Amino acid sequence: AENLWVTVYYGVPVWKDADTTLFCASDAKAHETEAHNIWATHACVPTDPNPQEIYMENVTENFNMWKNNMVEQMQEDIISLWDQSLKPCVKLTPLCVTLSCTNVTLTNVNYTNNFPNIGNITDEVRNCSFNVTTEIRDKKQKVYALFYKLDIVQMENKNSYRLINCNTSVCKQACPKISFDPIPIHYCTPAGYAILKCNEKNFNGTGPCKNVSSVQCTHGIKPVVSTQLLLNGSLAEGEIIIRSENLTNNAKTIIVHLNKSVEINCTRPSNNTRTSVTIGPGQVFYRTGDIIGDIRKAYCEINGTKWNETLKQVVGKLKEHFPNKTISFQPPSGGDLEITMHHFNCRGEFFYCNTTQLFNSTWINSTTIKEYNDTIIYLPCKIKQIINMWQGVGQCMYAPPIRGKINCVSNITGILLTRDGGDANATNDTETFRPGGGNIKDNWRSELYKYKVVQIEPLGIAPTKCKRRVVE
Amino acid sequence: YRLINCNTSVCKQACPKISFDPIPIHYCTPAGYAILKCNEKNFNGTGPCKNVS
Amino acid sequence: IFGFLGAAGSTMGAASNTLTVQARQLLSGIVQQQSNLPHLLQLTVWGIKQLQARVLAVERYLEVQKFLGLWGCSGKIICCTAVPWNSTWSNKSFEQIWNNMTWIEWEREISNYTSQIYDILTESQFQQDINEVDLL
Amino acid sequence: IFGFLGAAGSTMGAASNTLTVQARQLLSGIVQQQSNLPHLLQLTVWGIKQLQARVLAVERYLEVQKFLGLWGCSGKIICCTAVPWNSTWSNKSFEQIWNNMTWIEWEREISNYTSQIYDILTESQFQQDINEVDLL
Amino acid sequence: IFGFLGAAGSTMGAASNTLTVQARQLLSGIVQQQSNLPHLLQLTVWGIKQLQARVLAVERYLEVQKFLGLWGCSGKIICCTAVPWNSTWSNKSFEQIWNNMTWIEWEREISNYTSQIYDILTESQFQQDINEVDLL
Ligand SMILES: *[C@@H]1O[C@H](CO)[C@@H](O[C@@H]2O[C@H](CO)[C@@H](O[C@@H]3O[C@H](CO[C@H]4O[C@H](CO)[C@@H](O)[C@H](O[C@H]5O[C@H](CO)[C@@H](O)[C@H](O)[C@@H]5O)[C@@H]4O)[C@@H](O)[C@H](O[C@H]4O[C@H](CO)[C@@H](O)[C@H](O)[C@@H]4O[C@H]4O[C@H](CO)[C@@H](O)[C@H](O)[C@@H]4O[C@H]4O[C@H](CO)[C@@H](O)[C@H](O)[C@@H]4O)[C@@H]3O)[C@H](O)[C@H]2NC(C)=O)[C@H](O)[C@H]1NC(C)=O
Ligand SMILES: *[C@@H]1O[C@H](CO)[C@@H](O[C@@H]2O[C@H](CO)[C@@H](O[C@@H]3O[C@H](CO)[C@@H](O)[C@H](O)[C@@H]3O)[C@H](O)[C@H]2NC(C)=O)[C@H](O)[C@H]1NC(C)=O
Ligand SMILES: *[C@@H]1O[C@H](CO)[C@@H](O[C@@H]2O[C@H](CO)[C@@H](O)[C@H](O)[C@H]2NC(C)=O)[C@H](O)[C@H]1NC(C)=O
Ligand SMILES: *[C@@H]1O[C@H](CO)[C@@H](O[C@@H]2O[C@H](CO)[C@@H](O)[C@H](O)[C@H]2NC(C)=O)[C@H](O)[C@H]1NC(C)=O
Ligand SMILES: *[C@@H]1O[C@H](CO)[C@@H](O[C@@H]2O[C@H](CO)[C@@H](O)[C@H](O)[C@H]2NC(C)=O)[C@H](O)[C@H]1NC(C)=O
Ligand SMILES: *[C@@H]1O[C@H](CO)[C@@H](O[C@@H]2O[C@H](CO)[C@@H](O)[C@H](O)[C@H]2NC(C)=O)[C@H](O)[C@H]1NC(C)=O
Ligand SMILES: *[C@@H]1O[C@H](CO)[C@@H](O[C@@H]2O[C@H](CO)[C@@H](O)[C@H](O)[C@H]2NC(C)=O)[C@H](O)[C@H]1NC(C)=O
Ligand SMILES: *[C@@H]1O[C@H](CO)[C@@H](O[C@@H]2O[C@H](CO)[C@@H](O)[C@H](O)[C@H]2NC(C)=O)[C@H](O)[C@H]1NC(C)=O
Ligand SMILES: *[C@@H]1O[C@H](CO)[C@@H](O[C@@H]2O[C@H](CO)[C@@H](O)[C@H](O)[C@H]2NC(C)=O)[C@H](O)[C@H]1NC(C)=O
Ligand SMILES: *[C@@H]1O[C@H](CO)[C@@H](O[C@@H]2O[C@H](CO)[C@@H](O)[C@H](O)[C@H]2NC(C)=O)[C@H](O)[C@H]1NC(C)=O
Ligand SMILES: *[C@@H]1O[C@H](CO)[C@@H](O[C@@H]2O[C@H](CO)[C@@H](O)[C@H](O)[C@H]2NC(C)=O)[C@H](O)[C@H]1NC(C)=O
Ligand SMILES: *[C@@H]1O[C@H](CO)[C@@H](O[C@@H]2O[C@H](CO)[C@@H](O)[C@H](O)[C@H]2NC(C)=O)[C@H](O)[C@H]1NC(C)=O
Ligand SMILES: *[C@@H]1O[C@H](CO)[C@@H](O)[C@H](O)[C@H]1NC(C)=O
Ligand SMILES: *[C@@H]1O[C@H](CO)[C@@H](O)[C@H](O)[C@H]1NC(C)=O
Ligand SMILES: *[C@@H]1O[C@H](CO)[C@@H](O)[C@H](O)[C@H]1NC(C)=O
Ligand SMILES: *[C@@H]1O[C@H](CO)[C@@H](O)[C@H](O)[C@H]1NC(C)=O
Ligand SMILES: *[C@@H]1O[C@H](CO)[C@@H](O)[C@H](O)[C@H]1NC(C)=O
Ligand SMILES: *[C@@H]1O[C@H](CO)[C@@H](O)[C@H](O)[C@H]1NC(C)=O
Ligand SMILES: *[C@@H]1O[C@H](CO)[C@@H](O)[C@H](O)[C@H]1NC(C)=O
Ligand SMILES: *[C@@H]1O[C@H](CO)[C@@H](O)[C@H](O)[C@H]1NC(C)=O
Ligand SMILES: *[C@@H]1O[C@H](CO)[C@@H](O)[C@H](O)[C@H]1NC(C)=O
Ligand SMILES: *[C@@H]1O[C@H](CO)[C@@H](O)[C@H](O)[C@H]1NC(C)=O
Ligand SMILES: *[C@@H]1O[C@H](CO)[C@@H](O)[C@H](O)[C@H]1NC(C)=O
Ligand SMILES: *[C@@H]1O[C@H](CO)[C@@H](O)[C@H](O)[C@H]1NC(C)=O
Ligand SMILES: *[C@@H]1O[C@H](CO)[C@@H](O)[C@H](O)[C@H]1NC(C)=O
Ligand SMILES: *[C@@H]1O[C@H](CO)[C@@H](O)[C@H](O)[C@H]1NC(C)=O
Ligand SMILES: *[C@@H]1O[C@H](CO)[C@@H](O)[C@H](O)[C@H]1NC(C)=O
Ligand SMILES: *[C@@H]1O[C@H](CO)[C@@H](O)[C@H](O)[C@H]1NC(C)=O
C-alpha cells in the first residue's frame, strides 16, 4: 500500500477521438499511365502494397455517420482538384454573342437501324451559325456550329438565340488531353494517428460497434459523381441496409445500400465530328461540326427482372420500419435538372437520363407475385455540354465534344430516397418515396461510413511498486 | 503582314526592370546531406573517381 | 506476439508486455516518400497536404519527447520515478487495477487529474536534482 | 512561485529555483490549433505565416536538444560533467558570482568563448565513453 | 585532424576517433540565415523550396533519434547494449573486423540484417527493465 509510486509508461495502446488531415495515396499499378487524370494526379504518394488489417477484438467504440469529419476534407479536396484542373484551360468569353440559329436540315441516313424505335434526334440539336472574330481582332468571320438545345436560351426576338451561361459566369472548356476516369484513391493518415474500421456486416448507420478492426489507412475510394443513383460503389456484405439518422424525420435523404449488384448499360450510338475553330490569339474551340450516319437518342438498357427483384427486396426491408403502411414509388416531383434526372459522367461526356419508368410501382402485402418475363428496360437520356456540377462553389465547365461512339457500362450499388410528409388520419396507410435529391456529400457518406480517425496518446501512467534509486 | 507568334499563342513584353544577366548561383543541400566532388582531372562521363573530396 | 494497437481491449496487466509494437510506429509510416514522379508539383493541392501531414507527424511526436525529457525517464520505454501516489486520484488497490481494468478505461478514469500530476513529476525531478548539486 | 521569465533580474542563486517553469513552456502554445474554420484556406496569407511558426517552433527546441543530446546527460534539468575550468573565461570566485551578478549580465561576459566551450564539452563526453568500451 | 567525412575511407580502428566531428553537423547549416533581403517573396519557388529544405532537415535527423530513444542509448555517442551476436550475421573474428575492414562497406555486408537488428535490440531493452520494474 505505502509502496505505491507513479510509473510512467510509453507506447500504451490508448486513443482519443480527434480530427486530422489526410493525403492521397494512389495505387501503384493504377498510376503512371500518362493519362493526366483530374482526381488521382501524379502527385500522390505510392500506396503500401501490404496494408495491415489488425484485429482489435475485445473492445467497443462508438461510430457515427452524419458527423464523420472525413467527408468535409475529401469534399474540399474534390472541389479543389476540379477547380485547378480548369485553370490551365482556355476561357470562352468571346462566345457570349447573339446567335442566328436554325432547325436542322441534312441529308442523313433513313434506315437508322431502328431496333430501339424510340426516336431520332431531330429537334434535339440546333444548327446555329454565329459570328466571332479571328486571331486579328479587327476581323470577324462567320462560323457555324451544332449545339444541343439544353445549352441555348432565347432572351427575346425569336429566331435569335444565345448561350445559356452568359448571364451567370463564364465556363472554361476542358482541356482535351485530361480525362475524368475515376481512379481509386486511398486516403492515408499521417504517422501518429490511426483509422478505425467497424468490421460488422449488418452495420446500421450510427451507434456503437463491437467488432472494430484497425488499419493503417483505408482502401480505394471511387471519386465517381452521380445524382440519383450510386455508380460503381462498394456493396455491403450482410444484407440490404437502410441508413438514416432519423427515419421519422423527413427533412433529409435516405441512403439505400444493396448487397446484390445491378448492371446498367447506357451508350450513345451516333457520331459527332470534332472540328477546331480558332477564336483569338492562341485560343482554340472544339465544336460538334456535323453529325453523319447513325442518328438515335442515347439510351440506357437495364435488366428489368433484376430491377423487380431489387425493388421487392428493398420493399421487404422497409416493411419493418413502417410496419403497417403501404409503400409506393413516384418519379421526382420537380426542381432543378439533376434531381429530376439521372446524372453521371462517362468518357468525358455528361448524361441526363430520364429514368421515370423505373419508379412506377405499388406494393401492398406481397400477396401476389409480379410474374412477368424478361424484357429489357430502355430509357431516354439527353446530352448536355455546358455543365454546372455545383451550384456556386465550383466552376462552370464545358466538356469538349467526343467523336466516334461512346459505350460504357456501370453496375449499380446505391439508391437515394426521400420520404414524404403526411397527416395521421388523412393518410390511407400509405407512404410514398421519391428518388433523386441529395447533395454530393450524400454520395460519399455511403462509402466513408466505416472509418473514424483517432489520435494516439502513448503516455500511460499507473501506480506500481518502484522507487528510483538514489545517487550517493 | 502580322506577327508570327500573335496567332499561335500569347506573347508578353518583358518589363525592362528585370535583367537577363546571369548571376552565379551556388546550390547548397539541406543539413544532413553531403555533396561529393571529383577533383580528378581526366574524368570522362562515368567511372570510379579516386580523388573525390 | 501482437500487431499494432492489437491489444487495446485486453486487460492492463496482460497488455503491459506489448508496448514496443505501438512505440515503433510513431514516425515510420508512408509520408517519408516525396512523390511518385517529379510543373511545380510542390504547389498542387494534393502536394500541399504533405506539408500539413509531415509537420503534424513531428509536432505530435515531439510533445511526447518533451514530457519524457523533463521527467528523467527519457530514453526508456517503461520507466518509473519516485514520486508518491497519495490515492486521491485513484485509491484502488494493486490487484483491482492491473489485472482487470483495461487501459482505455483507466485513462478516462483519471483524465481530470492529469494536469496536476504532469506538473508534479517535473518538480519532483528538479528538486531531486537540486539535492545532487547540494550533495557533492 | 514565479511565472514565465519571473526571475530574469534576480540573482544567480535565487534564479536556480525557477528553471522548471520555463522548460515546460518551450513548445506549448496556441499555435497547435489549425484554424477557426477551414477560398483556399491552405494558402491563405494567414495560413502561410502560421505554418512558418510551427516549423520555427520545433527547430528552436531541436537546436537545444541536439547540443544537450551530445553532452551525455539527455533528460535532466541540471547537469554537471568533468570539464574543469581553465579559469580564464571567467576569473571570478564563487560567492562573487552566485550572489549579486545576474543571469542576463553573466551571459555577456562568457558569450565570447562559447564556440570554444561547446566544442570542448562534447569531446569530454566522447572521451569518457572511449575509455569505457575498452574497460569491461 | 580530420574534417567532415575525413576518415570515411580509413580503416575500422582509426575511424572511431572522429565520430564527433561528423556528428555536430546534422542540423546546423546555411538554412539558419533568413535571406539576402526579406515578386512573391514568401511564395516564390525558393520561398517553398527553402521551406521544403528545413522540414527535411529536422525529419531526417530526428528519425535517427527515434531508434536511439528506444534502445536506451539516448544521450551517448557510444553505447553498449546486451544483444549477443550469434555469429549468423557475420562470423569474421574481431581481429578481421577492426583491423582493415573500412566503415563504408562494413554495414553494407550486414545490410540484410538491419531490419531484424533494429527489432531485436528493441526487445532486449524491453526485457531488461520489465525485470527491473519488479525488482526494486
Ligand atoms: C464504372 O466502372 C466501369 C468498369 O470499368 C467503367 O467502364 C469502363 O470505363 C472506361 C472509361 O475510361 C472504359 O475505358 C475506355 O474505353 C474507351 C473506348 O473508346 C472507344 O472509342 C475509341 C475512339 O474514341 C476507340 O479508339 C476505342 O478502341 C480501343 O480503345 C482503347 C484502346 O486501349 C480500348 O479501351 C478499347 O476497348 C478499344 O480497344 C473504343 O472503341 C477508350 O477509348 C478509352 O481509352 C482512353 O483512356 C485510356 C486510359 O487513360 C487511354 O490510354 C487512351 O489513350 C484513351 O485516352 C485518350 O482519350 C482521353 C479522352 O477520352 C484523353 O484524356 C487521353 O489523354 C487520350 O487522349 C489521346 O487520344 C485522344 C483520342 O482518343 C486524342 O484526342 C488525344 O489528343 C490523345 O491523343 C478507355 O480505354 C472501359 O472500356 C469501360 N469498361 C467497359 C467494360 O466498357 C465505368 O466508366 C465506370 N463508371 C464511371 C461513371 O466512370
Ligand atoms: C420522362 O418521361 C415521362 C414519360 O414517360 C415524361 O412524363 C411526361 O412528360 C410530358 C411533358 O414532358 C407530359 O406531357 C404533358 O404533361 C402535362 C402535365 O400536367 C399533362 O397534363 C399533359 O396532358 C401532357 O401530357 C406527360 O403528361 C408526362 N407523362 C406521361 C405519362 O407522358 C417526363 O416528362 C420525362 N422526364 C422529363 C424530365 O421530362
Ligand atoms: C448548318 O448551317 C451551316 C451554315 O449556317 C450549313 O453549312 C452550309 O452548307 C451548304 C451546303 O453545302 C453550303 O452551301 C453553305 O455555304 C454552308 N454555309 C456555311 C459554310 O456557312 C450546314 O449545312 C448546316 N447543317 C445542318 C445539319 O443544318
Ligand atoms: C455576322 O455577320 C452577319 C453578316 O453581316 C451579320 O448579319 C447582319 O449583320 C448586320 C450588321 O449589323 C445587321 O445589320 C443585320 O441585321 C444582320 N443580319 C440579320 C439577318 O440580322 C451578323 O449580325 C454578324 N454576327 C453578329 C453576332 O452580329
Ligand atoms: C468481425 O467481423 C469479421 C469479418 O471480417 C468476422 O470474421 C469472419 O467471420 C466469419 C464467420 O463465419 C468467417 O467465415 C470469416 O472467414 C471471418 N473473416 C472474414 C475476413 O470475413 C469476425 O468473426 C467478426 N467478429 C466476431 C466476434 O464474430
Ligand atoms: C442480399 O441481401 C438480401 C436482403 O438484404 C438477402 O435476402 C434475404 O436472404 C436471407 C438469407 O438468404 C433470407 O432469409 C431472407 O428471406 C431474404 N430476404 C427476403 C426479402 O427474401 C440475400 O440473401 C442477400 N444475398 C446473398 C447472396 O446473401
Ligand atoms: C452495352 O450497350 C451496348 C449498346 O447499347 C451493347 O452493344 C451491343 O452488343 C451486342 C452484343 O455484344 C451487339 O449485338 C450489338 O450490336 C451492340 N450494339 C451496339 C450499339 O454497340 C453492349 O454489348 C452492352 N454491354 C454489355 C456488357 O452488354
Ligand atoms: C436478368 O436477371 C435475371 C435474374 O436476375 C436472369 O434470369 C436468369 O437467367 C439465367 C440465365 O439467363 C437462368 O439460368 C436463371 O434461371 C434466370 N433466373 C430467373 C429468376 O429468371 C435474366 O436472364 C437476366 N436477363 C438477361 C437479359 O440476362
Ligand atoms: C460491378 O458489379 C459486378 C456485379 O458482380 C461486379 O462483377 C464482379 O467483379 C468481381 C471483381 O473482379 C469478379 O471477381 C466477378 O467475376 C465479377 N462478376 C462476374 C459475373 O464476372 C464488378 O466487380 C462491379 N464493378 C466493380 C468495379 O467492382
Ligand atoms: C500562324 O500563322 C502562321 C503563318 O501566318 C502559320 O504558319 C503557316 O501555316 C500554314 C497553314 O495555315 C502552313 O501551310 C504553313 O506551312 C505555315 N508556315 C510554316 C513556315 O510552316 C501558323 O500555322 C499559324 N498558327 C496558328 C495557330 O494560327
Ligand atoms: C477479453 O476479455 C476477457 C475478460 O477476461 C478475456 O477472458 C480471459 O482470457 C484469458 C486468455 O487466456 C483466459 O485465460 C481467461 O480464462 C479468460 N477469462 C477470464 C475471466 O479472465 C479474453 O481473453 C479477452 N480477449 C482478448 C483477446 O484479450
Ligand atoms: C589508406 O591506406 C593506406 C595504406 O597504405 C594508409 O597508409 C598507411 O596508414 C597507416 C595508418 O594511418 C600507417 O600506419 C601506414 O604507415 C601507412 N602506410 C602507407 C604506405 O602510407 C592510409 O593512411 C590510408 N588513408 C587514410 C586516410 O588513413
Ligand atoms: C424545327 O422544329 C419545330 C418543331 O417541330 C418547327 O416548328 C420548326 O418549323 C422547325 N424548323 C423549321 C426551320 O421549320
Ligand atoms: C427523323 O427525323 C426527321 C427530321 O429530320 C423526321 O421528319 C422523322 O419523323 C424522324 N423519324 C424517322 C423515323 O424518320
Ligand atoms: C440500428 O439498427 C439496429 C439493428 O437492430 C437497431 O437495433 C438500432 O436501434 C439502430 N440504431 C439507430 C441509431 O437507428
Ligand atoms: C461513325 O464513325 C465514322 C466517324 O464519322 C463514320 O464515318 C461512320 O460512318 C460511323 N459509323 C457507322 C457504322 O456508320
Ligand atoms: C416490374 O413490376 C412492374 C409492376 O410492379 C411491372 O409492370 C413490370 O413489368 C415488372 N418488370 C418486368 C421486367 O416485367
Ligand atoms: C407510372 O406512370 C405514371 C407516371 O407519372 C404514373 O401516373 C403511374 O401511376 C405510374 N404507374 C403505372 C403503373 O403507370
Ligand atoms: C411473356 O408474357 C407472358 C407471361 O410470361 C407469356 O405468356 C408470353 O408468351 C411471353 N412473351 C413471349 C414473347 O414469350
Ligand atoms: C587529389 O585531389 C587533390 C585536391 O586538391 C589534388 O590537389 C591532387 O592533385 C589530386 N591527386 C593526387 C594524386 O593527390
Ligand atoms: C476510495 O474513495 C471512495 C470515495 O472517495 C470510497 O468510496 C472508496 O471506498 C475508497 N476505496 C478505497 C480502497 O480506499
Ligand atoms: C472487474 O471489473 C468489473 C467491471 O470492470 C467488475 O464487475 C468486477 O467486479 C471486477 N473484478 C475484480 C476482481 O476487481
Ligand atoms: C472531472 O471533470 C468532469 C467534467 O464535468 C467531472 O464530471 C468529473 O467529476 C471530474 N473528475 C473526474 C475524476 O472525472
Ligand atoms: C494528494 O495529491 C493531490 C495532487 O493532485 C493534492 O491536490 C492533494 O492535496 C494531495 N493530498 C494530500 C492529503 O496531500
Ligand atoms: C583556456 O581555454 C583556451 C581555449 O579557449 C585554451 O586554449 C587554453 O589552453 C585554456 N587554458 C588552459 C590553462 O588550459
Ligand atoms: C555584487 O555586485 C554588486 C553590484 O552588482 C555589488 O554592489 C556588490 O558589492 C557585489 N558583491 C561583492 C561581494 O563584491
Ligand atoms: C541469429 O539471429 C538472427 C536474427 O535475425 C536469426 O535470423 C538467426 O537464425 C540467429 N542464429 C542463431 C544461430 O541463433
Ligand atoms: C565464417 O565465414 C566464412 C565467410 O562468411 C564462411 O566461409 C565460414 O564457413 C564461416 N565459418 C563458420 C564456422 O561459420
φ and ψ at residue C14, rounded to 5 degrees: -80, -10
Query: Helix axis angle, C48-70 relative to E45-71, nearest 10°?
Result: 40
Q: Are A67 and A452 in contact (CB under 8 A)?
A: no
Q: Which of A267, A299, A408, A409 to mutate to test the pocket of ligand 7 (most atoms within 8 A of CB)?
A: A267
Residue A243 gets which letter from DSSP?
E
Q: Are A41 and C45 in contact (CB under 8 A)?
A: no
> Could you give the maximum distance between any two Cα atoms of chain E, in Å?
66
Q: Which of D33, D35, D39, D54 to substitute to test the interface with A, most A CBs within 10 Å? A: D39
Q: Which of E21, E28, E30 to substitute to test the interface with B, most B CBs within 10 Å? A: E30
Alpha carbons A81 and A78: distance in angstroms, whole number: 5
End-to-end CA distance of chain C: 47
D67: contact with C, CB 8 A cutoff: no
Alpha carbons A125 and A272: distance in angstroms, whole number: 12
Distance A227 CA to ligand 2 centre (A): 21
- Render C44-74 in DSSP notation, one character per residue: STTTHHHHHHHHHHHHHHHHHHHHHHHTS-T
CA distance D20 to chain A (A): 19
Going by C-alpha positions, the residue among A318, A311, A303, A194 that lies closest to residue A254 is A318
Which technique was the structure solved with, according to the deposited record? cryo-EM
E14: contact with B, CB 8 A cutoff: no
Cell of E100: 582493415
Identify which of E26, E51, E78 has the shortest CB distance to residue D129: E78
E48: contact with B, CB 8 A cutoff: no
Q: Are A240 and A203 in contact (CB under 8 A)?
A: no
What are the angstrom distances between the C-alpha of A16 and each of A217, A277, A305, C84, C89?
17, 59, 49, 27, 20
B15: contact with E, CB 8 A cutoff: no
What are the angstrom distances between the C-alpha of B51 and each of A362, B48, E3?
88, 9, 16
List alpha helices for C5-47, DSSP H: 19-23
Residue whose entry in the numeric block shows the C-alpha cell 470534332: A274
> Which residues line ligand 17 at a C-beta cut-off of 6 Å?
A 304-305, 308, 361, 370, 372, 375
Alpha carbons A366 and E56: distance in angstroms, whole number: 66
Alpha carbons A450 and A213: distance in angstroms, whole number: 10
Q: Are A289 and A431 in contact (CB under 8 A)?
A: no
What is the Cβ-side half-sphere exposure of residue D26, based on CA atoms within 13 angstroms? 21
> Could you give the maximum distance between any two Cα atoms of chain D, in Å?
66
Q: Which of A134, A136, A138, A284 to substitute to test the interface with B, most B CBs within 10 Å? A: A136
Alpha carbons A47 and A25: distance in angstroms, whole number: 5
In the sheet with A212-215, reading across from the earlier edge strand, the strands are A15-17, A451-456, A193-198, A212-215, A53-55
Count of beta carbons in the 10 Å neighbourhood of residue C109: 14
Q: Which of B51, B52, B53 to mutate to test the pocket of ligand 20 (most atoms within 8 A of CB)?
A: B51
Strands (E), A56-180: 61-63, 101-102, 125-133, 140-148, 152-153, 162-163, 172-173
Alpha carbons A19 and A43: distance in angstroms, whole number: 24
- Render A281-342 in DSSP notation, one character per residue: TTEEEEEE----S-----EEEE-HHHHHHHHHHHHHHHHHHSTT-EEEE----S-STTTTSE
User: Is C86 a pocket residue for ligand 24 (Cβ < 6 Å)?
Assistant: yes
SS3 content of chain D, % helix, strand, coil (to 5): 50, 0, 45
Which residues in chain B have their CB less than 8 angstroms from residue E61's CB?
31-32
> Which residues line ligand 9 at a C-beta cut-off of 6 Å?
A 232, 261, 411
Interface of A with D in 38-97 (CB under 8 A): 76, 80
What are the angstrom distances between the C-alpha of E48 and each of B18, D48, E43?
22, 10, 7
Q: Are E99 and E13 in contact (CB under 8 A)?
A: yes
Which residues in chain E have their CB less than 8 angstroms from residue B30's CB?
29, 31, 53-54, 56-57
Count of beta carbons in the 10 Å neighbourhood of residue D25: 11
Q: Are A11 and C20 in contact (CB under 8 A)?
A: yes
User: Is D86 a pocket residue for ligand 25 (Cβ < 6 Å)?
Assistant: yes
Burial string for E19-50 (b: 16+ CB within 10 Å, else e) reads eebbeeebbebebeeeeeeeeeeeeeeeebee
What is the Cβ-side half-sphere exposure of residue D35, based on CA atoms within 13 angstroms? 17
Residue whose entry in the numeric block shows the C-alpha cell 535571406: E35
* Burial class for A374, CB neighbours closer than 10 Å (0-12, 13-18, 19+): exposed
Could you tell me how many helices (H) and strands (E) chain C has, helices first?
Answer: 5, 0
β partners of residue A407: A267
Residue whose entry in the numeric block shows the C-alpha cell 526485457: E127
Identify which of E4, E30, E60 has the shortest CB distance to residue B32: E60
Residue A151 gets which letter from DSSP?
G
* Ligand 26 atom at minimum distance from D95 CA: 13
Helix (H, G, I), strand (E, B) or coil at A443: helix
Q: Are C12 and C101 in contact (CB under 8 A)?
A: yes
Identify which of D55, D71, D125 has the shortest CB distance to residue E55: D55
Instruction: Identify the H or E element spanning D52.
Output: helix D45-70
CA distance E34 to chain D (A): 12
β partners of residue C11: C102
Residue A237 gets which letter from DSSP?
S
Which residue's CA is the closest to the ligand 27 atom numbered 4?
E116
D75: contact with A, CB 8 A cutoff: no
Q: Are E65 and E27 in contact (CB under 8 A)?
A: no
Chains contacting C (3 or more CB pairs within 8 Å): A, D, E
CA distance E63 to chain A (A): 12
> Taking CB atoms and an 8 Å limit, are E136 and A469 in contact across chains?
yes
> Taking CB atoms and an 8 Å limit, are E78 and D122 in contact across chains?
no
* Burial class for C43, CB neighbours closer than 10 Å (0-12, 13-18, 19+): middle
User: Cα torsion for E49, E51, E52, E55, to the nearest 10°?
Assistant: 160
Cell of A307: 430491377
Chains contacting E (3 or more CB pairs within 8 Å): A, B, C, D
Going by C-alpha positions, the residue among E31, E11, E5 that lies closest to residue E95 is E11
Which residues in chain C have their CB less than 8 angstroms from residue A21's CB?
49, 52-53, 56
> Taking CB atoms and an 8 Å limit, are C58 and E58 in contact across chains?
yes
Helix (H, G, I), strand (E, B) or coil at A268: strand
Alpha carbons A19 and C14: distance in angstroms, whole number: 30
Sign of the CA dihedral running E111, E115, E117, E121: positive
CA distance D114 to chain C (A): 23
Alpha carbons D103 and B13: distance in angstroms, whole number: 60
Q: Which residue of C has its CA nearest to E74?
A: C75
Which residues in chain C have their CB less than 8 angstroms from residue D82's CB?
none
Resolution (A): 4.2
Q: Are B32 and E53 in contact (CB under 8 A)?
A: no
φ and ψ at residue D52, rounded to 5 degrees: -60, -35
Query: What SS3 string covers chain E?
Result: CCCCCCCCCCCHHHHHHHCCCCCCCCCCCHHHCCCCCCCCCCCCHHHHHHHHHHHHHHHHHHHHHHHHHHHCCCCCCCCCCCCCCCCCCCCCCHHHHHCCCCHHHHHHHCCCCHHHHHHHHHHHHHHHHHHHHCCC
Cell of D120: 570542448
Helix (H, G, I), strand (E, B) or coil at C94: helix
Residue whose entry in the numeric block shows the C-alpha cell 578481421: E96
C51: contact with A, CB 8 A cutoff: no
Which residues in chain D have their CB less than 8 angstroms from residue C79's CB?
none
Identify which of C17, C40, C54 has the shortest CB distance to residue E55: C54
β partners of residue A380: A299
Q: Which of A360, A361, A433, A434 to mutate to test the pocket of ligand 18 (most atoms within 8 A of CB)?
A: A360
Identify which ligand lies nearest to the alpha carbon of A270: 16
